[PDB]
C-alpha cells in the first residue's frame, strides 16, 4: 500500500524545527576532453558539500533507531552522468565535504555537454539518491585565436564566479588554487575558492566598498576578486593576457575560459599577484628586452582562469524514512501571478503538491520546469477574514506524496486591497 502522505501536524513540526539536508556541488563550467588512454583531470576538482543541520538530525535518528556510526555515515560516489565511464568514491569520513581530484571525460563520450552525477547512500545501504551538477561544456582544447563575444559560454561576465590556479612546469602535483583560509589568501593544493570577478571603472578608488560595472571582462580592465564565502578581497587588479612567461600590457580582447592570466596590482611598481609555495604575495615583474608592451613575470604569477558553477538541493524526510530516493530534488527559481501562483524551476514531477504554510494547495503539473497552483483563500490562515485586513506572509514549500519536504527560500504574501 502507498506510503503515508505528509500531515498538517508533521508540516507544522517541520516549519518550527527545520532540520533540512542540503547537497552542494561546486564545479567548473568547462572541461577539456581526454583522447586515447590519457587522463586530463577536471581543475578545479569538483567539490561536494553536505550542508544544513539535517545531516546531524538524520545521523541521531538512525542511531536511536539502532544504527552504528558506520551505518549512519553518508557514502558518496561521483562520475560523468549518463555514461559507461566508472564512478569514484568520495571520502566523507570526519568531514562535511570532499573533492574529486581524478575526474576526466574521454573522447568515447560524443556529447558536447554533460553533468556530474553524485550517487549517495548511508553505511546501512539506505539509498539517498543521485544529484546532478550544472551543465559542463566539453572542449577539445582552448583556441589560440582571440575570443568573440558571440560565444558567451567561452567568455566571463562581471559578477560571475571563477577559480584561479597555477601549475609549475606541467606537473599535476604542483597545482595550486587561490583560496581563502583563516582570513588570509593562500595557494592551496587541496582546496579552491570560487571568486566573484567584478568589473570596475578605471576611475574607481581603492576601498572595501566599491561600485561595479556590467559586461564581459577584457584584458586591461580593472577588476575585483572577492571570495564568494568569506567576502575577502584582494586590492584592485588589472587582468592581463599572459603570452609564454610575459604579461601583455596592450591586450584588450575578451578574457576566455582556461586562458593564462596575470593580475597586475593596480598603481604599484609592476607588482603581480603571485604564489611562493602555499603563500600568496606580489612579485615585481622585469622589463622585456627591447619591448615596453610586455613584462617578464614570476613562475607563480600566471593563473589559469575558469568559470565555476554550483548545483544545490534541499530535502527533509517529513514523514520519516522512505523507500524511493529523495532525488530528483525540485529547485524553485521564481514565483509569478481564481488566484493562481506559477512556479518556475527544475525537477518538478506530478507527485508534488505546493504548500502555503501548513495548507496544502491544488497543484497542476505542466512539465519539469513549470507548476501552477491555486492560492488558498486568506480564510485558510485567518479564520474569519473574508478579505486581506493585514499583510500575511506564508512560506512556499514543495511536498512529495511520500512526505518528502523540499523547502524554498521563497515566501508568498497576502497583500491587502
Amino acid at each position: 500500500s502507498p506510503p503515508k502522505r505528509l500531515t498538517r501536524e508533521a508540516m507544522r513540526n517541520y516549519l518550527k524545527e527545520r532540520g533540512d539536508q542540503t547537497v552542494l556541488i561546486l564545479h567548473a563550467k568547462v572541461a577539456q576532453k581526454s583522447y586515447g588512454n590519457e587522463k586530463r583531470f577536471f581543475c578545479p576538482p569538483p567539490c561536494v558539500y553536505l550542508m544544513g543541520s539535517g545531516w546531524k538530525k538524520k545521523k541521531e535518528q538512525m542511531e536511536r533507531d539502532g544504527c552504528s556510526e558506520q551505518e549512519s555515515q553518508p557514502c558518496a560516489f561521483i562520475g560523468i552522468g549518463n555514461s559507461d565511464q566508472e564512478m569514484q568514491q568520495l571520502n566523507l569520513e570526519g568531514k562535511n565535504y570532499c573533492t574529486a581530484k581524478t575526474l576526466y571525460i574521454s573522447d568515447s563520450d560524443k556529447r558536447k555537454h554533460f553533468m556530474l552525477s553524485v550517487k549517495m547512500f548511508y553505511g546501512n545501504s539506505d539509498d539517498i539518491g543521485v544529484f546532478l551538477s550544472k551543465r559542463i561544456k566539453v572542449i577539445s582544447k582552448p583556441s589560440k585565436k582571440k575570443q568573440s563575444l558571440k560565444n558567451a559560454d567561452l567568455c566571463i561576465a562581471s559578477g560571475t564566479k571563477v577559480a584561479l590556479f597555477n601549475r609549475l612546469r606541467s606537473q599535476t602535483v604542483s597545482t595550486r588554487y587561490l583560496h581563502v583560509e583563516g582570513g588570509n589568501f593562500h595557494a592551496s593544493s587541496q582546496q579552491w575558492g570560487a571568486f566573484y570577478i567584478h568589473l570596475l571603472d578605471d576611475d574607481e578608488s581603492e576601498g572595501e566598498e566599491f561600485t561595479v560595472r556590467d559586461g564581459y571582462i577584457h584584458y586591461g580592465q580593472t577588476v575585483k576578486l572577492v571570495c564568494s564565502v568569506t567576502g575577502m578581497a584582494l586590492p584592485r587588479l588589472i587582468i592581463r593576457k599572459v603570452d609564454k612567461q610575459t604579461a601583455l600590457l596592450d591586450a584588450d580582447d575578451p578574457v576566455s575560459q582556461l586562458h593564462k592570466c596575470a593580475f597586475y596590482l593596480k598603481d604599484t611598481e609592476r607588482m603581480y599577484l603571485c604564489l611562493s609555495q602555499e603563500r600568496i604575495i606580489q612579485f615585481q615583474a622585469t622589463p622585456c628586452p627591447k619591448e615596453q608592451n610586455k613584462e617578464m613575470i614570476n613562475d607563480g604569477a600566471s593563473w589559469t582562469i575558469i568559470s565555476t558553477d554550483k548545483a544545490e538541493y534541499t530535502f527533509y524526510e517529513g514523514m520519516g524514512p522512505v523507500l524511493a530516493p529523495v532525488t530528483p530534488v525540485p529547485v524553485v527559481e521564481s514565483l509569478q501571478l481564481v488566484a493562481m501562483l506559477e512556479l518556475t524551476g527544475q525537477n518538478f514531477t506530478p507527485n508534488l503538491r505546493v504548500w502555503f504554510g501548513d495548507v496544502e494547495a491544488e497543484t497542476m503539473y505542466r512539465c519539469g520546469e513549470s507548476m501552477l497552483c491555486v492560492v488558498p483563500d486568506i480564510s485558510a490562515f485567518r479564520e474569519g477574514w473574508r478579505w486581506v485586513r493585514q499583510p500575511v506572509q506564508v512560506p512556499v514549500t514543495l511536498v512529495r506524496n511520500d512526505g518528502v519536504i523540499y523547502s524554498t527560500s521563497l515566501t508568498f504574501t497576502y497583500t491587502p486591497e
Partner: peptide, 15 residues
C-alpha cells in the same frame, strides 16, 4: 559604492 568586502594585502618581493 554597492559591493562590500574585507581588503587583504599581499607582501611585496623583487628578487
Amino acid at each position: 559604492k554597492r559591493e562590500h568586502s574585507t581588503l587583504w594585502f599581499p607582501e611585496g618581493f623583487s628578487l
